């Protein structure tokens, strides 16, 4: 399975200028595009090698779409402040996430188009790509406007067609990196925490995609509720890192084993301190 996902953020800044609009686009866990409305003469810009050869008409087209979205989001933010009777003195944030998920045959599993305001659900295109869920009575104003204008039909056309087709094209153009797993490089660290306990931490570094499973066992028994897990974080080079830690009685370290599961590992790895 693969996905393409866009993330839009528009933020008003009363008394410090007009709202700022940022867009990023991902295929799976790999960013490929950005746009920042604060840039002087802003452009859609490549962030992955496999869109750098798309050509100037493509990039002009994406840039045109982002500029229109940035200007429109200024209107939307103003409308929302009016729906809610909010003060012009406060800053507010509009977010949108949209995209498509594909199955192993390249068919569309699910399309998305969800919006948030002030950090919480505002309105969402339903799974059927034909109706809306409004989070409150303000979002119901938007819903009636979008129903009258057949907004859902336009999104469905994009989600079932353009989104699927271009995701498949990006996957083929970038297959050498997008369709290749990078196995995690692993080690265990050890830190006493008192006279009688010690931290064992299992590290996974340099892996792609981000999905990974790190577990600790005591004499073979899973230690699920005693394992502290950090959220998977970016290394900065397109790969990821994660650690999982357990606090154990001093002198009992030898009972514990770390287990690592990743697409890049044909067999799970076991580590011990």
């Amino acid at each position: 399975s693969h996905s393409m996902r866009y993330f839009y953020t528009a933020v008003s800044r009363p008394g410090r200028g007009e709202p700022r609009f940022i867009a990023v686009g991902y295929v799976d866990d790999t960013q490929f595009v950005r746009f920042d409305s604060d840039a002087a003469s802003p452009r859609g810009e490549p962030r992955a090698p496999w869109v750098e050869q798309e050509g100037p008409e493509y990039w002009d087209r994406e840039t045109q779409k982002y500029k229109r979205q940035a200007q429109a989001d200024r209107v939307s933010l103003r409308n929302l402040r009016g729906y809610y009777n909010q003060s012009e003195a406060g800053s507010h944030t509009l977010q949108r996430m949209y995209g498509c998920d594909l199955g192993p045959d390249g068919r569309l599993l699910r399309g998305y188009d969800q919006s948030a305001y002030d950090g919480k659900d505002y309105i969402a295109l339903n799974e059927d790509l034909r109706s809306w869920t409004a989070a409150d009575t303000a979002a119901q104003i938007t819903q009636r406007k979008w129903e009258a204008a057949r907004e859902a039909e336009q999104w469905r056309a994009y989600l079932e067609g353009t989104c699927v087709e271009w995701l498949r094209r990006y996957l083929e153009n970038g297959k050498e990196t997008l369709q290749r797993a990078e196995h995690p490089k692993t080690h265990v660290t050890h830190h006493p925490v008192s006279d009688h306990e010690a931290t064992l931490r299992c590290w996974a570094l340099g892996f792609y995609p981000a999905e990974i499973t790190l577990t600790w066992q005591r004499d073979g028994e899973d230690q699920t509720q005693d394992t502290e897990l950090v959220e998977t974080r970016p290394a900065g080079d397109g790969t990821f890192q994660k650690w999982a830690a357990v606090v154990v009685p001093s002198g009992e370290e030898q009972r514990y084993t770390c287990h690592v599961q990743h697409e890049g590992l044909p067999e799970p790895l076991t580590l011990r301190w």
């Binding site: 779409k65 939307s76 409308n79 336009q154 353009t162």
Partner: peptide, 9 residues
């Protein structure tokens, strides 16, 4: 490839 449509909330 980004969504081409445009409609205010």
């Amino acid at each position: 490839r980004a969504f081409p449509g445009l409609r205010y909330v």
